Amino acid sequence: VQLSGEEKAAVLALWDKVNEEEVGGEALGRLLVVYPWTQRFFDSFGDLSNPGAVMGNPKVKAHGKKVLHSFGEGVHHLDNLKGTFAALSELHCDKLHVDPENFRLLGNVLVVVLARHFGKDFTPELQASYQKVVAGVANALAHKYH
Amino acid sequence: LSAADKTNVKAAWSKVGGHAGEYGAEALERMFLGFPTTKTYFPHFDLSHGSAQVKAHGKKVGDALTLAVGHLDDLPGALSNLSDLHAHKLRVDPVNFKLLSHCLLSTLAVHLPNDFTPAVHASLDKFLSSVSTVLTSKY
Ligand code: HEM
Ligand code: HEM
């Protein structure tokens, strides 16, 4: 990802404040509510029918935490996103058959959640940096479809 | 847009209230910085932080969205001058509507965190897609 030193430091400094459980659980929950076809991949989690059911589902929280943890790995390895997400790219392509469009959707949801949690500290400049990160992650996840 | 979506959109916009223009301006700024390809539609603007042209244009965007919320049953009739502008005169790439939509939701999350619930998020997403559709529908 093309980030200046300034931008990297700002990205890393925000991540220090990210609660992976709360942000993760919220991001995955909002994906399932806002883009309901995404529910097809998570039938094993039980009832995802209304928004109440989605946001309090403990499997949604636990999975959301794993997702954000793995995003954090990417934030800490921005020089090697291809290598960091190789195994996950294979899983999502060959085992799960997730269309890569949905990786961009989740990245964008994550950005909206960061905005919600951080308010006026999530400046337009900081958001711009985060858009570069979520795009880099989405592309590295898409790598083993190409 | 279902009856439930329309209620949620009317509700959420009532909380936006008089801030529509300031949020429109902030969404534009978030878009220009986040997605630099969008700047090429605005060669005639000063795009620096707090430029007055962006504030003025943000107001016009906010006002049009307020208009749309009042005409949810007839978005085509209410927005059709703007469809002509965006499709025939400006030839805006349809992708750019999704970017601005994302930037507006981001802005709303910043300023209305308690009101920006998952159900309200879902209904606003649908509202902004429906508007986008109308503004790209004349090609
Ligand atoms: C874009 C960022 C995304 C990241 C970082 C990510 C990351 C992960 C991780 C870390 C796992 C756990 C694998 C394991 O425990 O071995 C996983 C599993 C999975 N992901 Fe993703 N994912 C992403 C997007 C998506 C999207 C958009 C979908 C679906 C629409 C999806 C569906 C799944 C499913 C079904 C599993 C297996 C769940 C289970 O069996 O418990 N992922 N993902
Ligand atoms: C929700 C989506 C949008 C709304 C409601 C909207 C609304 C408007 C309005 C109300 C005008 C001014 C009409 C007038 O004063 O005659 C306008 C003009 C314009 N719009 Fe949009 N717009 C949208 C999306 C976009 C996007 C995505 C772009 C490009 C990235 C764009 C580019 C422009 C440009 C270049 C003009 C002419 C500005 C000027 O010369 O002053 N619009 N739009």
Residue numbers in the entry:
A (entry chain B): 1 to 146
B (entry chain A): 2 to 140
What do the authors of the reporting publication say about this deposited model?
Hemoglobin (Hb) is an iron-containing heme protein that is essential for oxygen transport. The protein is an assembly of four globular subunits, each containing a heme B (protoporphyrin IX group; Hsia, 1998). Equine hemoglobin was among the first protein structure to be solved at high resolution. It is a useful model system for oxygen-sensitive metalloproteins due to its ubiquity and its high but reversible affinity for oxygen.
